[PDB]
RNA sequence: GGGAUGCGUAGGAUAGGUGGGAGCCUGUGAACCCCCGCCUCCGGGUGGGGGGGAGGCGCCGGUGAAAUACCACCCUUCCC
């Protein structure tokens, strides 16, 4: 068959014609999650934007009230006293020039990269073509560059997420784990949707949230009413 | 409503986009063989069937701008 027996059994638990409330979705995706790990819960939105024009990009960050439910390995690149600041703030790795070389030679065992602005000339130039095509190059709009590197690191450790519409006009994010209490998933979902609506482009035509689904890593989708 | 389609070069080879992913599939029948329709960039791909009877795939590494299982929302080019 096109799917395995685990997946096939899940399919009957979702009504394809029903649009669930967020509360119903939060409860349901915990029944759906069946893989042998703590499946990541996801939200997908089909946006009423024109992804061909830069003034209708939907890009941003948000801290979920209850975070991400996974460790985030953070690499910090810094100088001066920021180095030890990054360290005591709990960055998994902290370094300078030599850290840059290490990455530049193929080291990638980290989940996020953050930097002080006074290494970004070097990081940008040398690591741009390496971290770029993988969405890891630090950026102060994404809240990953700045001299308060302690706060950035903690913000990210505490699972602050990014969202960026794809070129087809859909957007996607992780919003929690299927092991979370349902009310805490609901909170994270509403928090993410609230952030998307905060970034609705001024000139976007039509309904902004054309479709919104909740799913988890390995299971079917649940279509939801974003305004519930 | 339903069904297909996604290949420069390098690379197992047919890598549409992004997000999730460290697991996934398998006597609820793996690999493999065989037949037919469709598609094809003529490499193969894809959907279904006739057999088979125990493992196959991913991750890591490698190539690459991008990495592959599995899952989600989409988009392209089409056809009932």
From Swiss-Prot:
Record's keyword terms, sorted: Repressor, Ribonucleoprotein, Ribosomal protein, RNA-binding, rRNA-binding, Translation regulation, tRNA-binding
Annotated PROSITE patterns: RIBOSOMAL_L1
InterPro entries named in the record: Ribosom_uL1_bac-type, Ribosomal_uL1, Ribosomal_uL1-like, Ribosomal_uL1/biogenesis, Ribosomal_uL1_3-a/b-sand, Ribosomal_uL1_CS
GO CC terms, sorted: large ribosomal subunit
Pfam families: Ribosomal_L1 (PF00687)
UniProt-listed GO biological process terms: regulation of translation; translation
GO MF term (any one): rRNA binding
Function according to Swiss-Prot or TrEMBL: The L1 stalk is quite mobile in the ribosome, and is involved in E site tRNA release. Binds directly to 23S rRNA.
Subunit structure: Part of the 50S ribosomal subunit.
NCBIfam families xrefs: rplA_bact (TIGR01169)
Family per record: Belongs to the universal ribosomal protein uL1 family.
Official protein name in the record: Large ribosomal subunit protein uL1
Organism of this sequence: Thermus thermophilus
């Amino acid at each position: 068959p096109k799917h395995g027996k685990r997946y096939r059994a899940l399919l009957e638990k979702v009504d394809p014609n029903k649009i669930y409330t967020i509360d119903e979705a939060a409860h349901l995706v915990k029944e759906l999650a069946t893989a042998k790990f703590d499946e990541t819960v996801e939200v997908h939105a089909k946006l009423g934007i024109d992804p061909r024009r830069s003034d209708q990009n939907v890009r941003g960050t948000v801290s979920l009230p209850h975070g991400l439910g996974k460790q985030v390995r953070v690499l910090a690149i810094a100088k001066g006293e920021k180095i030890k600041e990054a360290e005591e703030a709990g960055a998994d790795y902290v370094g300078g020039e030599e850290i840059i070389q290490k990455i530049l030679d193929g080291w990638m065992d980290f989940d996020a990269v953050v930097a002080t602005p006074d290494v970004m000339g070097a990081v940008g130039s040398k690591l741009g073509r390496i971290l770029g095509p993988r969405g890891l190059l630090p950026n102060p709009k994404a809240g990953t560059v700045g001299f308060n590197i302690g706060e950035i690191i903690r913000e990210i450790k505490a699972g602050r997420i990014e969202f960026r519409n794809d070129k087809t006009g859909a957007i996607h994010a992780p919003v929690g784990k299927a092991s979370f209490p349902p009310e805490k998933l609901a909170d994270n979902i509403r928090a993410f949707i609230r952030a998307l609506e905060a970034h609705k482009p001024e000139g976007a035509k039509g309904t902004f949230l054309r479709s919104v689904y909740v799913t988890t890593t390995m299971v079917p989708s649940v279509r939801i009413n974003p305004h519930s």
